[PDB]
Amino acid sequence: WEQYRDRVNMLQQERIRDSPLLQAAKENDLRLLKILLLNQSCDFQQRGAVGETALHVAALYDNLEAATLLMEAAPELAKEPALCEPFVGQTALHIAVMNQNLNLVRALLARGASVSARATGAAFRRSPHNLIYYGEHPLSFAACVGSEEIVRLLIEHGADIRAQDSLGNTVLHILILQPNKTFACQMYNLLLSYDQSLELVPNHQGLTPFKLAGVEGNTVMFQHLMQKRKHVQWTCGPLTSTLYDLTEIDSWGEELSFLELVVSSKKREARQILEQTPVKELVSFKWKKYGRPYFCVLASLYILYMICFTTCCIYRPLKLRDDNRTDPRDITILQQKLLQEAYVTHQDNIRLVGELVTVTGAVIILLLEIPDIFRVGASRYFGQTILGGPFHVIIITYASLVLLTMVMRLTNMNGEVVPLSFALVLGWCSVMYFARGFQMLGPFTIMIQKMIFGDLMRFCWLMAVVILGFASAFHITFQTEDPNNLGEFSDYPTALFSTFELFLTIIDGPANYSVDLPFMYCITYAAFAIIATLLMLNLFIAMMGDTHWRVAQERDELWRAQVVATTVMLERKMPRFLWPRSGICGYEYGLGDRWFLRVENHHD
Amino acid sequence: WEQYRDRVNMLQQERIRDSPLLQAAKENDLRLLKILLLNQSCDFQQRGAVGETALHVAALYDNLEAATLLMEAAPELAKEPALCEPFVGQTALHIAVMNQNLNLVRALLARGASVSARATGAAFRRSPHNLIYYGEHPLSFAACVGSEEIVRLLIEHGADIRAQDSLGNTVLHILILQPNKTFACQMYNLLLSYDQSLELVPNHQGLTPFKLAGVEGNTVMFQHLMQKRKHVQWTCGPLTSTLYDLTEIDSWGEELSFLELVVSSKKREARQILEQTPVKELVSFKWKKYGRPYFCVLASLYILYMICFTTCCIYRPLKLRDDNRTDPRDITILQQKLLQEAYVTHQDNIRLVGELVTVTGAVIILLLEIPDIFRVGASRYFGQTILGGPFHVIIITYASLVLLTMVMRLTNMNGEVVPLSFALVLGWCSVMYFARGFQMLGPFTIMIQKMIFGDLMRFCWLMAVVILGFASAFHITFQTEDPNNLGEFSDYPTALFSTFELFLTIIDGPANYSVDLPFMYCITYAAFAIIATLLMLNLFIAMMGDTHWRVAQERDELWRAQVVATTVMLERKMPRFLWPRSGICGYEYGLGDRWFLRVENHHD
Ligand SMILES: O=C(CCN1C(=O)COc2ccccc21)OCc1nc2scc(-c3ccccc3)c2c(=O)[nH]1
Ligand SMILES: O=C(CCN1C(=O)COc2ccccc21)OCc1nc2scc(-c3ccccc3)c2c(=O)[nH]1
Ligand SMILES: O=C(CCN1C(=O)COc2ccccc21)OCc1nc2scc(-c3ccccc3)c2c(=O)[nH]1
Ligand SMILES: O=C(CCN1C(=O)COc2ccccc21)OCc1nc2scc(-c3ccccc3)c2c(=O)[nH]1
C-alpha cells in the first residue's frame, strides 16, 4: 500500500546493483559495453526485478551513448514493455519523454518504437498516494510535462491526438488537472489548434472538459476557455459591450447542469470559480429577479405553518388526575386525556384541523426531502455548509418526530411531552435555513454553525471532566449532612446538574447561614471559583474572539456560494412556466437556438 | 565575579600606562624602541599586571613594526605564556590569530612559536558571563573566527587537527556552537575534508557532534550535515526518491537516543529542529502507525480506573450518629463507620474489591513514575511543557494522597473527606495528560496551562489585596448590627469568603428590606461595584484576549514537540516485541546492518 512501494524499489535497485550489464549501463562505461557487445554469448533481453530492460535502465539515468550503442547492438528491445505490478506498461519511450531529451526520443522513433503503448499500473493512476498524474499515453506525457518540440514530433507520427485511457479521460482533461497552468495554457491552445471532435467529448464519469474546469476550479484555464466563445460587439470611448455565450454555463437540456455540478464540489476553488464575469453576472441577475420573491414567500409560509403547530401544541387536551398524590415530593395536577374524549366541541374540532395540517406539512416536507437525497450521496448532502447538511438533518429529525408523535397519540400511550418538546424545539430552531438570502443574517449564521463544531466541540470535552471531577467532590463533602437546609447535593444526578449550573453561574452559589457548612466544602468551592469560572469561562471568550478574527473572510467567500446553491435548487425545483430562461434569444436575431448574454463593460 | 573583571582590566591598563617600554610599544614609536634596544641594560622580559609581555601588548594593539623589532632584538619572548588569574595560558600567537593578521602569525611561526599552548582561565571558558566561546587552542581560534589562509598554515605545522581541551570538546563542537553558520559551514567542510577519526568522537559530557547539533538546534548545520549521508536514487520528471540514513537519528544500541536527547532540551530550537525532513517523516510515520493505537487504549484504561475509584468513593460506609446535636448550628446526621463493620455483606465485599484495585493502581502509578524521575533531573522533568511537569506533579500528589487515605482508613482515624476530596479532584483533573495526541484538544490544554501561570498568577496577587481591603470594611460596617437579618458579615473568615464571592458575582448582593442598612455600607458597596466588578473582572477578559492573540503560534510550534515526546516515551517504555524498528533493512539488500529510509520527494 505504502511500504510495498519501498519493498519493490529496493528490490529493483538491488537487482540493478547486482547485474553487471545493467550496472555498466548505470555507470555509463564504454569498454565494458564494448566487450559485452562483442562477446555475443551474453544475453541482452535479460529482465531485472520489475520488467527492467537495459534500455529502461539506460533511459532512467540518461545515458545517451549507452542507449545508442545498445540499439545499434540489438534493436529488438524497444517494443517490449514491463510485466510486473507497480510499473506494468512502462516503455523506454515513456521514461524518455518524461526525462525530456529530444535526441533519445528521436533515436527511439528512428529505431521503430510504437507510440500507442499503454501503461496501466499503480504508478500512472489517479490516486492520492502517487504524487503526480501525467496520463497513460506518450502524448499525454509530453503535453502534460509541457514540452514544445516533442508534441509535433509525436503527432506527425500519428500518436492519437484524440486518445482514451483509464477512467475515460483524454489529453485535455489531463492538461486541465494540472497545477502549473501558465505553460499549460499554450499547450491546451496548441492541441485545440491541432484538433464533436475533442471539446464536446465526455469521460467515463460524464465530465466534458468545461465541466471538469468547473469542478476542479482552475480559474485561469476557465478564463482562457471563455475567450473561445466570447463574441465582441462595438467599442467607443472607454466602454465595450462584450457578448458572452451561456449554452454551456446553464444546461437546460440535461438535469445535471454546470452550475449544479460546480456548486456541490468538495474542493476550495468551487466557490472561487463563481466570481468570473459570465457566471457572476448571470447568477446575480437571476438571483435578484427570481430568487428573492419566492424565498420570501417560502419563509413566510414556513413561519406561518410553525406558528400553527405551536398554537396547536399549546392547546393540548388535559383531564384532572383522580388518583391521589400521597407523597411529599409529587406534583401532577393534570393528566393526559384519553383519545375517546378528543372530539367534544368546536375547540376540539379546531385542534383536529390543526393536527391535520401539521401532519400534512410533515409528510410534504419528508416527500420533498427524500427523493433529492436518494440521488446526491449522503456525504455531499449532509456534510457541506454550501448545501445545508446541518439543516436537512434537523428537518428530517423534526418530520420523523412529528410522525412518531401522531402515531403515539393514536396508539393511546402516555408521555406525549417526550417527543413533543423535541419536535417543537427543533422545528423552531430550523427557521435559520431561511436566513441565506438576507445579507444581514447571512454571515452570522455561518459564524454560529462554524463556532459550534469548531470551538464548542473542543470545549465541552474539557468541561465534562471538570464538572465530573467536581460534582463527586461536592457530593462527598455533603453526604453526611441534612437535605433540609441544602437542597442541592443530595444524590449524584442532581449533584452533577447543580455543579454544571454553578459552572455556568446561571444559578447562585449555595449558601445558608442557619447552619454551619464544612471547611472542606468551603475550600474546594473557593478553588472551584478561580479554577473553573474566572479562568475557563473567560478563556472561551478570547478563543471565540480569535476564531472570529481569523475566519472573517471564509464567511464572506462562502455566503455567495450558498446563495448560488439556493438559486440553483429553486431553479431545478419550481416549474418552468414560472421559471423562464436567462439572457436574450438568438432565433429572432439571425443566430439560431443559442441563448446569449450581453454584459456591458468599462475599462480605463 | 563581574566587578573583578573591571578590577583586573584597570590594573592591566594602569601598568601599561606606567611602564615606559610597554607605553612605547602601545604608541608605536620607532626611536624609543631603537634606544631601548640599543641600551642593553634595560630588561626585556619584564611582566606587567596579568602576565603582560611586550610582545603581548604589541599584538593586542596590532603594532607589526614594534613586534618585528622586538623579535629581532630578543626572540625569547614567544614561548612564555602568562601566569595570572583571568588570562592564564594566553600567547602572542593566540591574540594574533584572534586579531586576524597573516603577517604577524607568519613572523611568529618563523620565530619558533609552539602551536599547542593551552589557555585555561576565566576568559576562554564556556560560561554565560563571557561573551564569546572560541576554544582553548589556536586551531580552534582560527577555525572558529572563520579565517581561510591561517588554518592551512597551522595544520601543515601539525597543530592538532584532532585536539582536546577543557570539557572534552574539539574543533567540530566549537564550530557547531557558533551563531554565524554561513562562513562556518565551509570551515566545517574543509576540516572534515582534512580529516572513528573525528566525527564519531564524544566529549566529556557524552555528545557526539551530531547530537550536539541536535541539542543546540542549529538547523542549517544540521541540514548540511545530513547531506554527507543522503544516498540518492534515480530521478525522472520532477520527482526524486532520496534515501536517507537513520542509524544516528534513532540509536537502538544506547538508551540515550538522539531523539530523546533533543526532545528534552531547554533552548528555543529543540522544537524547530524537529521539522527537517529525515526526522519529521520518521516520527510522522512512527506516530501515526504506532502511537495512537496504544495511547487510545491507555486513555480508556485510565478513565475506566478513575470511574472505578469514583464509584468506590461514592459507596462509602456510614453509621448513624447516636450522640445528640443539641446546638442550633450543628448538622451531622451520618457518622463514619468503624473499621470492624467494614466486611458485613456482598456490597462491602464489592467495596473491598474496589479498594484493592484502587491501591494497586496507585502503587503501579508510583512505581512507573519514580525510576524515570531518578535519572532525568527534577528541573527538566518538572519544569518544561514538552515533557509534562504540571501533570506528573499532580499524579505523584494523587498517588501519595490515595496512599495516605488507605493508611488513614486502616489506622481508624476520623475525617476521611479531608484527603479523599483532594485525591478525587486531582485524579479527575489529571485526565488532561491524555489530550496530547488529539488535534482538537491539542492546543487548548497548552493554552490553559499557559494562561494559568501567565495571567492568573499576575491577577490573583492584585485580587487578594482588593478583597482583603474590602472585607474588613464590610465587617466594620456590619459589626454593630444583627446576624438575624444579614447572614453574611458576622465574623472575619465568612466576611472574607463572602467578599470574594461578591467579587466573582457567583452569589447575589446582600439585600433585605425588612430592616434599614447603613449609609456607609451603601456607599462603599456602590464604590465596590464599579471598582472591583465592572472594571477589573472585565479587564481580565481583554488581557487573556491579547495573550491568546500573541501566543497563537507557540502552541502550534509546541504541540508537535510534545507529541514527539510522547512517541519517544512510549517507544522507550513498551517492549520491543511489540515496538519493532523503523524503516527498511539493509541486510537482505546488499548493504549490511544499516537501517535506511526512503522518502519520496517532488520539486518544480
Ligand atoms: O426544496 C428543498 C428543501 C426542503 N425544505 C422545504 O421544502 C421546506 O423548507 C425547508 C426549510 C428548511 C430545510 C429544508 C426545507 O429540497 C431539498 C434541497 N435543498 C437544497 S439546498 C441546496 C441544494 C443543492 C443544490 C444543488 C446541488 C446540491 C444541493 C438542495 C437540494 O438539492 N435539495
Ligand atoms: O456533546 C459534546 C461531546 C459528545 N458528543 C456528542 O454529544 C454528539 O456526538 C459526538 C460525536 C463526536 C464527538 C463528540 C460527540 O460536546 C460538544 C457538542 N457538539 C455538538 S454537535 C450538536 C450538539 C447538540 C446540541 C444540542 C442538543 C443536542 C446536540 C452538540 C453538543 O451538545 N455538544
Ligand atoms: O509512562 C509514564 C507516564 C506515567 N503515567 C502512567 O503510567 C499512567 O498514565 C499517566 C497519566 C498522567 C500522567 C502520568 C501517567 O512514564 C513517565 C514518563 N512520562 C513522560 S512524558 C515525556 C517524557 C520524556 C520523554 C523523553 C525525555 C524526557 C521525558 C516522559 C518520561 O520520561 N517518563
Ligand atoms: O495563589 C496565588 C498566589 C499565591 N501562591 C500560591 O498559592 C502557590 O505558590 C505560589 C508560588 C509563587 C507565587 C505565588 C504563589 O495566585 C495565583 C495562583 N497560581 C497558582 S499555580 C497553582 C494553583 C492552584 C490552583 C488550584 C488549587 C491549588 C493551587 C494556583 C492558584 O490557585 N493561584
Numbering used by the authors:
A (entry chain C), B (entry chain A): 29 to 223, 230 to 638
Quoted from the paper:
The fifth derivative, ZINC17988990, was found to be a potent inhibitor of TRPV5 mediated currents. This compound exhibited robust inhibition of rbTRPV5 with an IC50 of 106 ± 27 nM while also showing marked selectivity for TRPV5 over TRPV6. In order to verify that the newly identified TRPV5 inhibitors, ZINC9155420 and ZINC17988990, bind to TRPV5, we utilized cryo-electron microscopy (cryo-EM) to solve the structure of rabbit TRPV5 in the presence of each compound. We were able to resolve nanodisc-reconstituted TRPV5 in the presence of 10 µM ZINC9155420 or ZINC17988990 to 4.3 Å and 3.8 Å, respectively. At these resolutions, we were able to clearly identify that the ion conduction pathway for both inhibitor-bound structures are in non-conducting conformations. The ZINC17988990-bound TRPV5 structure revealed two densities that could be attributed to bound compounds. One density identified in the ZINC17988990-bound TRPV5 structure is located between the intracellular S1-S4 bundle and the TRP helix and it is present in the sharpened map as well as both of the half-maps. Though the upper region of the S1-S4 pocket has been consistently occupied by lipids in the previous TRPV5 channel structures, a density lower in the pocket has been identified for the first time in the ZINC17988990-bound structure. In the case of TRPV6, this was proposed in spite of lipid binding reported in the same area in previous structures. This precedent, along with the absence of the lower density in previously published TRPV5 cryo-EM structures, has led us to attribute this density to bound ZINC17988990. The residues that constitute this binding site in the S1-S4 bundle of the ZINC17988990-bound TRPV5 structure include E403, D406, Y415, Y467 and F468. The substantially reduced inhibitory effects of these S1-S4 bundle mutant channels indicate that this compound exerts its inhibitory effect primarily by binding in this pocket. Specifically, the S2 and S3 helices of the ZINC17988990-bound TRPV5 have moved toward the ZINC17988990 density, which creates a tighter space with in the intracellular section of the S1-S4 bundle compared to the lipid-bound apo TRPV5 structure.
TRPV5 is a calcium selective ion channel that is responsible for the fine tuning of calcium reabsorption in the kidney and has been shown to be a critical component of systemic calcium homeostasis. In the cell, binding of PI(4,5)P2 is critical for channel opening while rapid desensitization occurs via binding of calmodulin (CaM) to the base of the pore. The transmembrane domain (TMD) consists of transmembrane helices 1–4 (S1-S4) bundled in a voltage sensing-like domain with helices 5 and 6 (S5 and S6) domain swapped to create the pore of the channel. The intracellular portion of the protein is primarily composed of tightly packed ankyrin repeat domains (ARDs).
